[PDB]
């Protein structure tokens, strides 16, 4: 009936999907034509968001759900079996996301109980889970990774490993992997008057002016900005407000165009003008 | 028995039946939900509003590449442009002589492309004065062709020969303007017209000094005989009998040609000259040939005006802006900021990505100053579209752009690896 | 082919129209069905805007045009003849508007030569024309009347008689009928970066917080709110900016809903929220 | 030969072929351009998102008018409401007992509509205490019906009788809760349950004092026998063995009913009581019955909360908001600011105008304090829709609303006059 989230594969070859019928379908789009390939069923409740891991680790795809469990489906010659499962949270799991391929193969999941698990991968079918309790007050909805940024020796750098995240408390808390081993909330961002729906960490076009977008029940979209590296300054700026809720927000890769999904079943595109004010480039559909 | 959870969860989740969604993907395509997909995933794509035919033919990209010298950057093996003999001129061939583009381009090619005199001459005060002029004619000679239909035809309309003469002047045609003068028994003009081309104060004053007298009672002569003496005075638009009135039916460009031919106030910069005209007259709002002049006119403030201009008008084609900055930057022609250049290089290199023109997109990426960004993009672009940049795009683009031996092998290996399981 | 402006009659009975074919058509709308009634032809150039006078003066309708002339068509028993004409401006006449019915029967016209005529009516077929030269630098496009506001004796009050007006200079100059007899520019409003297209003086819902809307080539729509504590302090506020020009703006009567015409052949509706930010209520068409 | 001016003027006027337009009109209809009109004037109309059936029947407006007393204002003959015996109660009849509206309305009618003795006894210490209670039962008695299906059914599920008892209490049903207690050989409870309804410290302490002891090496005790003694302690949610845990499967409203029945922690005002519950528990989002409580709860801050509330939720229906302010204003029930009242009177009287139901509009319009505004609207509304307000709308609405004799004659005459020429 109604799908929730669906994301294209890297190298634009597949297209995983999931709807409230608890079915994780992986289609294939060669030439523009859709063609199913498997219907990974396994959640006691509707699937929420879904994310493809980086081809550098073979072919992986994880899906979270209202069943409080998250699944990771590997692939070995067409063998789409699940190599690991994780039910570390008590309430539904609104979102998942993968850490930039350099940190390794880390997966971030925000539940509705107000927590956040982080599955790191080891040599074999093993997965450690550094968890964050009471991250948000009433639960969490969004989880986005901060772009992998590189900081005289034979070493792969230690990254700042940050990742933002909105929730039901209206706060968009940023986070960071403390040198010792656990994450801590580097900062809070309270600009929304109701539930934060989604939070997307725009990719850095090599540019140091890192941005982040958010949309919430109030129907406003903010593009929080940081003027320089290392200054704990996030100055929100209003994109627009619709009389209805905004459900999703995503960044287009090159221009940094924002796809604003929400309001009237309509989706909008925005590009920040040479003036600084954001505009609607067109109406989709 | 199964609908109450959908209701409970739909509700225990602040979810209206209005919930929609959309997300861009790696290839730069967005997935809207429409009910038109086997699974309701309208994978629409992103429009490259970049419209200029030649961009889709190997030859241009291929040929325009030999126009450059690539060299790995100071902080990594990622290639960046060292030297580029790129001129507006280049582009002309691939366009058609009737389009406004050819004009906009042909124009720039005149205003900026570097005038190059043939035979080397000892005397430099001279060489500097020649090029000074070569560029002058070149430009007026152009406008003469742009106002050709306009005036030529406006001449068929007269029963006034004196007015006919003033018109021939307007086309910088002294020879015919003179012939007419003698043939109508209005010779004294053929004399002034003779002087017109030069700069002799005797005349200048003789003209103006007369003009002043002509405003006292005796006003028994043609607006045309007057308009003509006005062309001798020196400044015709800021005069005692001004021509500012012509804005009615003449092309602002018709007028401009005047200020550039007879409107010499003193010997100094053309750029500044052009600029003088702009002051008395405002130019067509969304006009590209117009804008381009302001850019030429505002000499040192070049980049400042540009910024100022682009902030108000969608009259300059992304690709142009870029080609401008670039041709101007690698010829010393003007003053352009690294931040602003790369700022507009992304712009273009993006449209080229939207288009699925990875080689053109990638190439334009090399004019990236920011070594981090360059590497940053290149690694990305290539890592995703290797197959596309291989076997037939001309068979080597990447070696041509001095791209990293390793990067190729790496990203290559990665996909073969990817396809490996899929099969 | 293409119409320009068309305005419904008071008492919602007729519907005058005009298009670039120099034809001023008056259609009747009884029950929702359109039915022509006369094609008043008479302009050497396309007709621009059109306005219906107040039924208190019979049935009048005026139309301006690119022909530099303005026409006033009376009506006597179906006799739609023109009782007066006025060609007091040298360049086209972008707009017309009637002064609130209490001031009398005054008509304001802004030309493209940068002037503004004001036809007042007298006892018979006579019309005096107090004119305003060089009101705007490159011409004028909009002309809107300020709502009729009433200030111990037998007298019909002397009103502040103001009326705003945008133009090609980007300035939205307000105006006022000086006690002696002529108008003067009470104030300028420079917030637009290009030509001001239209300027509409929202009607006062009895409320003293008089507003005014404007839209221009830059593609921004401002709402100049004003608390005239005896001094002209008009603080503009941005409604929205579209990447394309906005052509017209009108006020809905009760709610003060703004109909924003311009951009993508689409028309939008807006209402200022209980929060102060204006929102789009819907998309027309 | 005729297209060049259209081009010249279209261009000499900065007019893109994109030029569109739209203007609202006197009747409140907008004219979009669509090509669907003989002359391309899509006269679409404005939607009155005001969804509530009864508004379209004379009877309601007509009948609800006798509920008022009109009187010309102090600064003009324009009528304004002097006295209005308007209660939420009134509205109930025209609605249906299953809708959330009936609830929202029935609820308010309880929380705000005045309570009253039906016999003249005047110990103000008594009468004031009765109404105090009448309002109490009235409300709990309601929630009992709202949680009826919820709990009743949740009882069919229990093998445990003790848990069954605690449940019957949750419905404020002591009689049956007791019967069960004795019938299961768990009598001592039937005793406490007896006391439960009253307020005796002996017990209270006996309970709590026991509870404390029960935390020391004494397990194998039902969570139910405990939960029950907790209901005796006094405050059950802020306790030594709290019930705050119930937020899991019980409707927040189920809990509230508790604090209102056994949670009489202190012997004070109800409004403040309700408020106590809100503190420990978060409320249901987008919920109208919810909001209405906060309004009742926040006594003196009434208008402040309202403002605060409306700024975050579209759950409260324009017409409601209005009817609220109004029923509360003419009964002394709460504290409401003229600015805020009229602020919301316009709101409603507007929706009624888009619907064209002028009769209603004009009437709500009288709920205007600003004599200028009242006059201002009324004159307008009537001047435009006289015909509509005449002959059959019931044949006199205007005389009924003590409207000005002159205004009628004036606006009337004006249209007859208007129609006069049209013919």
Contact in structure between A47 and A4 (CB atoms under 8 Å)? yes
Chains that touch D (3 or more CB pairs under 8 A): A, B, C
Phi, psi of D318 (to 5 degrees): -25, -60
Establish if B373 touches chain A: CB-CB under 8 angstroms.
yes
- The Cα B57–Cα B63 span in angstroms is 10
Element (DSSP H or E) covering residue C95: strand C95-98
Instruction: Specify which residues C278 forms β-bridges with.
Output: C272
Contact in structure between B63 and A45 (CB atoms under 8 Å)? no
Establish if C8 touches chain D: CB-CB under 8 angstroms.
yes
Judged by CB atoms closer than 8 Å, whether chains meet at D282 and A138 is answered as yes
Chains that touch B (3 or more CB pairs under 8 A): A, C, D
Chain A partners of D281 at a C-beta cutoff of 8 Å? none
Hey, CA dihedral for B251, B253, B255, B257, is it positive or negative?
A: negative
Establish if D14 touches chain B: CB-CB under 8 angstroms.
yes
Half-sphere exposure of B78 (CA within 13 A, CB side): 23
DSSP C62-93: EEEETTS-EEEE--SSS---EEEEE---SS--
Establish if A193 touches chain D: CB-CB under 8 angstroms.
yes
Residue with tokens 């725009």: A202
Chains that touch A (3 or more CB pairs under 8 A): B, C, D
Domain ranges of chain B: 1-49, 50-145+238-423, 146-237
Domain ranges of chain A: 1-285
Rg (CA), chain D: 30
Nominal resolution (angstroms)? 3.0
C139, two tokens: 């011409």
- The Cα D294–Cα D301 span in angstroms is 10
Cα nearest neighbour of A276 on chain C: C241
Element (DSSP H or E) covering residue B151: helix B148-156
Q: Within the 47-66 window of chain C, which residues sit less than 8 Å (CB to CB) from chain D?
A: 55-56, 58-59, 66
Q: CB atoms < 10 A from the CB of B378, how many? A: 23
Q: CB atoms < 10 A from the CB of D297, how many? A: 21
Establish if B383 touches chain A: CB-CB under 8 angstroms.
no
- Interface test mutation site (partner C, options D4, D6, D25, max chain C beta carbons within 10 A): D25
Cα nearest neighbour of D34 on chain C: C285
- Terminal C-alpha separation, chain B: 43
- The Cα A120–Cα D343 span in angstroms is 57
Q: CB atoms < 10 A from the CB of B360, how many? A: 25
B242, two tokens: 């001004």
Identify the CATH number of the domain defined by range A1-285.
Answer: 2.130.10.10
Strand order in the sheet with A211-216: A196-200, A211-216, A220-225, A238-241
- The Cα D320–Cα A72 span in angstroms is 50
Establish if D406 touches chain A: CB-CB under 8 angstroms.
no
C154, two tokens: 């037998």
Q: CB atoms < 10 A from the CB of C107, how many? A: 26
Q: Which residues fall within 8 angstroms of residue C254, CB to CB, at 6 or more apart?
A: C205, D28, D346, D349, D350, D353, D354
Establish if B286 touches chain D: CB-CB under 8 angstroms.
yes
Q: Within the 211-230 window of chain C, which residues sit less than 8 Å (CB to CB) from chain D?
A: 217
Chain C partners of D364 at a C-beta cutoff of 8 Å? none
Burial of D64 (C-beta count, 10 Å sphere; 0-12/13-18/19+): middle
Judged by CB atoms closer than 8 Å, whether chains meet at A243 and C277 is answered as no
Instruction: Specify which residues A148 forms β-bridges with.
Output: none
Three-state DSSP at B234 gives coil
A120, two tokens: 């790191």
- The Cα B76–Cα B8 span in angstroms is 57
- The Cα D177–Cα D168 span in angstroms is 5
- The Cα A60–Cα A56 span in angstroms is 10
Establish if D286 touches chain B: CB-CB under 8 angstroms.
yes
Cα nearest neighbour of B283 on chain D: D12
Across the interface, which of C241, C273, C277 has its CB nearest the CB of A277?
Answer: C241
Chain C partners of B314 at a C-beta cutoff of 8 Å? 243
Nearest CA among A156, C142, A5, A43 for reference residue B25: A5
Contact in structure between A196 and A214 (CB atoms under 8 Å)? yes
Burial of D118 (C-beta count, 10 Å sphere; 0-12/13-18/19+): exposed
Cα nearest neighbour of D309 on chain A: A193
> What is the bridge-based pairing of β-strands C3-8 and B79-84?
unpaired
3-state secondary structure chain A: CCEEEEEECHHHCEEEEEECCCEEEEEEECCCCEEEEEEEECCCCCEEEEEECCHHHCCCEEEEECCCCEEEECCCCCCCCEEEEECCCCCCCCEEEECCCCCCCCEEEECCCCCEEEEEECCCCCEEECCECCCCCCCECCCEECCCCCCCCCCCCCCCCEEECCECCCECCEEEECCCCCEEEEECCECCCCCEEEEECCCCCCCCCCEEEEEECCCEEEEEECCCCCCCCCECCEEEECCCCEEEEEECCCCCCEEEEECCCCEEEEEECCCCCEEEEEECC
C-alpha distance from A279 to closest chain C C-alpha (Å): 6
Contact in structure between C233 and C226 (CB atoms under 8 Å)? yes
C98, two tokens: 């009637």
C-alpha distance from A76 to closest chain C C-alpha (Å): 49
Judged by CB atoms closer than 8 Å, whether chains meet at C241 and A281 is answered as no
- Interface test mutation site (partner C, options D13, D73, D346, max chain C beta carbons within 10 A): D13
Chain C partners of A277 at a C-beta cutoff of 8 Å? 241
Chain B partners of D249 at a C-beta cutoff of 8 Å? none
Nearest CA among B314, B319, D32, D33 for reference residue A281: B314
Residue with tokens 């682009």: B310
Across the interface, which of C248, C262, C274 has its CB nearest the CB of D311?
Answer: C274
Judged by CB atoms closer than 8 Å, whether chains meet at B22 and A248 is answered as yes
**Angle of the B371-384 helix axis to the B338-354 helix axis, nearest 10:** 10
Q: Which residues fall within 8 angstroms of residue C75, CB to CB, at 6 or more apart?
A: C58, C59, C60, D421
C27, two tokens: 């259609």
C-alpha distance from C172 to closest chain B C-alpha (Å): 19
Judged by CB atoms closer than 8 Å, whether chains meet at A138 and D312 is answered as no
Q: Within the 15-34 window of chain B, which residues sit less than 8 Å (CB to CB) from chain A?
A: 16, 18-34
Cα nearest neighbour of D370 on chain C: C206
Hey, CA dihedral for B328, B330, B335, B338, is it positive or negative?
A: positive
Torsion of CA B262, B275, B237, C195, to 10 degrees: 150
Contact in structure between B195 and B203 (CB atoms under 8 Å)? yes
C-alpha distance from A117 to closest chain B C-alpha (Å): 21
Judged by CB atoms closer than 8 Å, whether chains meet at C243 and A283 is answered as no
Chain A partners of D312 at a C-beta cutoff of 8 Å? 193-194, 218
C-alpha distance from B4 to closest chain D C-alpha (Å): 14
Cα nearest neighbour of C192 on chain B: B312
C-alpha distance from B184 to closest chain D C-alpha (Å): 34
3-state secondary structure chain D: CCHHHHHHHHHCCCCCCCCCCCCECCCCCECECCCCCCCCCECCCCCCCCCCHHHHCHHHHHHHHHCEEEEECCCCCCEEEEEECCCHHHHHCCCCCCCHHHHHHHHHHHHCCCCCCCCCCCCHHHHHHHHHHHHHHHHHHHHHHHCHHHHHHHHHCCCCHHHHHHHHHCCCCHHHHHHHHHHCCCHHHHHHHHHHCCCCHHHHHHHHHHHHHCCCCCCCCCHHHHHHHHHHHCCCCCCCCCCHHHHHCCCHHHHHHHHHHCCCCCCCCHHHHHHHHHHHCCCCCCCHHHHHHHHHHCCCCHHHHHHHHHCCCCCCCHHHHHHHHHHHHCCCCCCCCHHHHHHHHHHHHHHHHHCCCHHHHHHHHCCCCCHHHHHHHHHHHHHHCCHHHCCCCCCCHHHHCCCCHHHHHHHHHHHHHHHHHHC
- The Cα A69–Cα A86 span in angstroms is 6
- At the second CATH level, the architecture of D146-237 is Alpha Horseshoe (1.25)
Q: Right CATH number for B1-49 from 3.30.470.10, 3.40.50.150, 3.40.1080.10, 6.20.50.170?
A: 6.20.50.170
Judged by CB atoms closer than 8 Å, whether chains meet at D312 and A193 is answered as yes
Burial of C237 (C-beta count, 10 Å sphere; 0-12/13-18/19+): middle
DSSP conformational letter for C272: E
């Amino acid at each position: 009936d109604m799908i929730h989230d669906a994301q294209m594969d890297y190298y634009g070859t597949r297209l995983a999907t999931c709807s409230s019928d608890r079915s994780v379908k992986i289609f294939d789009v060669r030439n523009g034509g859709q063609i199913l390939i498997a219907d990974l069923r396994g959640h006691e409740g509707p699937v929420w968001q879904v994310a493809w891991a980086h081809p550098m680790y073979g072919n992986i795809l994880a899906s979270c759900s209202y069943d409080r469990k998250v699944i990771i489906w590997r692939e070995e010659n067409g063998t789409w079996e699940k190599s690991h499962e994780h039910a570390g949270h008590d309430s539904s799991v609104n979102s998942v996301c993968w850490a930039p391929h350099d940190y390794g193969l880390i997966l971030a999941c925000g539940s509705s109980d107000g927590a956040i698990s982080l599955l790191t991968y080891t040599g074999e079918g093993q997965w450690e889970v550094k968890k964050i309790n009471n991250a948000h007050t009433i639960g969490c909805n969004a989880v986005s990774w901060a772009p992998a940024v590189v900081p005289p020796s034979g070493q792969k750098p230690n990254y700042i490993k940050r990742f933002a995240s909105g929730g039901c408390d209206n706060l968009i808390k940023l986070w960071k992997e403390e040198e010792d081993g656990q994450w801590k909330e580097e900062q809070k961002l309270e600009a929304h008057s109701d539930w934060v729906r989604d939070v997307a960490w725009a990719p850095s076009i090599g540019l140091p002016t890192s941005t982040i977008a958010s949309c919430s029940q109030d129907g406003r979209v903010f593009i929080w900005t940081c003027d320089d590296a290392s200054s704990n300054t996030w100055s929100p700026k209003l994109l627009h407000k619709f009389n209805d809720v905004v459900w999703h927000v995503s960044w287009s890769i090159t221009a940094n165009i924002l796809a604003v999904s929400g309001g009237d079943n309509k989706v909008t595109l925005w590009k920040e003008s040479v003036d600084g004010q954001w505009v609607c480039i067109s109406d989709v559909n | 028995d199964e609908i109450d959870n959908a209701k409970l969860i739909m509700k225990e989740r602040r979810f209206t039946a209005s919930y929609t969604f959309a997300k861009f993907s790696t290839g730069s395509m967005l997935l809207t939900k429409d009910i038109v997909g086997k699974s309701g995933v309208s994978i629409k794509r992103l429009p490259t509003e970049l419209q200029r035919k030649f961009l889709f033919d190997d030859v241009y990209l291929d040929k325009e590449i030999e126009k450059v010298t690539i060299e790995a950057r100071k902080s990594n093996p990622y290639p960046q442009i060292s030297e580029s003999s790129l001129l507006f001129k280049d582009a002309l061939d691939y366009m058609e002589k009737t389009s406004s583009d050819y004009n906009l381009w042909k124009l720039s090619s005149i205003l900026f492309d570097p005038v190059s005199y043939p035979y080397k001459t000892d005397n430099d005060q001279v060489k500097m004065a020649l090029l000074k002029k070569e560029r002058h004619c070149r430009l007026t000679s152009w406008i003469v062709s742009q106002i050709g239909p306009e005036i030529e035809e406006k001449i068929r309309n007269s029963s006034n020969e004196i007015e006919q003469i003033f018109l021939y002047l307007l086309l910088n045609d002294v020879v015919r303007a003179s012939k007419l003068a003698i043939e109508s028994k209005n010779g004294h003009l053929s004399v002034l017209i003779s002087y017109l081309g030069s700069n002799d104060p005797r005349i200048r004053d003789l003209a103006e000094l007369q003009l002043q007298k002509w405003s006292t009672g005796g006003c028994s002569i043609d607006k045309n005989i007057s308009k003509i003496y006005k062309l001798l005075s020196g400044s015709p638009f800021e005069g005692l009998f001004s021509l500012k009135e012509l804005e009615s039916e003449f092309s602002w460009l018709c007028l401009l040609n005047l200020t550039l031919c007879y409107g010499q106030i003193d010997e100094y910069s053309l750029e500044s000259l052009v600029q003088s005209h702009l002051d008395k007259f405002s130019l067509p709002y969304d006009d590209p040939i117009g804008v381009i002049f302001q850019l030429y006119a505002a000499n040192e403030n070049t980049e400042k005006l540009y910024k100022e201009v682009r902030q108000r008008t969608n009259a300059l084609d992304v690709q142009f802006c870029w080609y401008l900055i670039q041709t101007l930057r690698f010829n010393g022609t003007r003053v352009f900021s690294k931040e602003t250049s790369d700022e507009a290089t992304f712009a273009f290199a993006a449209q080229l990505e939207f288009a699925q023109l990875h080689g053109h997109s990638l190439f334009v990426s090399c004019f990236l100053n920011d070594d981090k960004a360059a590497e940053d993009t290149i690694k990305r672009l290539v890592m995703r579209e290797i197959t596309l940049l291989r076997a037939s795009t001309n068979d080597h683009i990447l070696n041509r752009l001095k791209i990293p031996s390793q990067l190729i092998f790496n990203a290559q290996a990665l996909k073969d690896r990817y396809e490996g399981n899929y099969l």
